[PDB]
Write a structure and sequence with these properties.
Layout: E1 5-9, E2 14-18, H1 54-60, E3 65-69, E4 80-86, E5 92-99
Bound molecules: 4'-hydroxycinnamic acid (HC4).
Length: 100
């Protein structure tokens, strides 16, 4: 995956996104990575339950699953498949998204 592969820490901050290796856009780069999630009391960012039991993933100590989620609604995103993996570094977990 040259796109879809993001690595985040098991505390709540994004570390690196695997895709940025060629700045061929003039976007505002405050979209992804460098994300320190402060307790602004915002549990509604399209994910009431974080990813795939991400909240349990952390404390269970084995956040590594591939789960495909189909959106059979109207105003929903495309069918994606999340492969999360507890980073081999330790207290961090990856997120590989892959649309079908
Ligand atoms: C999170 O924001 C959950 C519910 C909700 C309901 C109504 C409005 O306007 C915002 C949010």
């Amino acid at each position: 995956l040259a796109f879809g592969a993001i690595q985040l820490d098991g505390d709540g901050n994004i570390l690196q996104y695997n895709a940025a290796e060629g700045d061929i856009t003039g976007r505002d780069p405050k979209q992804v990575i460098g994300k320190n999630f402060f307790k602004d009391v915002a549990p509604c960012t399209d994910s009431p339950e974080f990813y795939g039991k991400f909240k349990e993933g952390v404390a269970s100590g084995n956040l590594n699953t591939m789960f495909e989620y189909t959106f059979d609604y109207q105003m929903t995103p495309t069918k994606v498949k999340v492969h999360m993996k507890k980073a081999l570094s330790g207290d961090s977990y990856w997120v590989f998204v892959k649309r079908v």
